[PDB]
Amino acid sequence: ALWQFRSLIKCAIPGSHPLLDFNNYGCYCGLGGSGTPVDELDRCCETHDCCYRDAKNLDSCKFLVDNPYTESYSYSCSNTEITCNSKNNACEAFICNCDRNAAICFSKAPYNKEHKNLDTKKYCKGESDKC
């Protein structure tokens, strides 16, 4: 679920404010996405977008979960380490992992303030054929 993704990000990145820091960043961090990712961090979001695209096509997710942000999963956080609990079913596990990988990627990528609140209509034209 969305509140869990925010929580995973805070686990991986102590002191972060997910909605302020990552939502609406670059071409892919936020609802939707297009163009070529402007940087490593943006590529993390493109990858997460793709992961959610894949999740929607998973058998265990197909009709039960149309929007992964409404699907809660089981996880734990310890010393900035994220764990997707085994109790998760196929659909819940896939989503948790998408979020977990995204959170880690975010924590290891440089943060470019000038890529925040990007004018996507001017800098995100076209479509990246990735993932």
Ligand X SMILES: CCCCCCCCCCCCCCCCOC[C@H](COCC(F)(F)F)OP(=O)(O)OC
SS3 81: strand
User: What length is written for the chain?
Assistant: 131
Tell me 129's DSSP state.
-
Site string for Ca ion, 20-59 (x = CB under 5 A): --------x----x---------------x----------
Least distance in angstroms from the C-beta of 28 to Ca ion = 5
Least distance in angstroms from the C-beta of 10 to Ca ion = 19
Q: Does 18 bind ligand X (CB under 6 A)?
A: yes
* Interface positions with Ca ion (CB under 5 A): 28, 33, 49
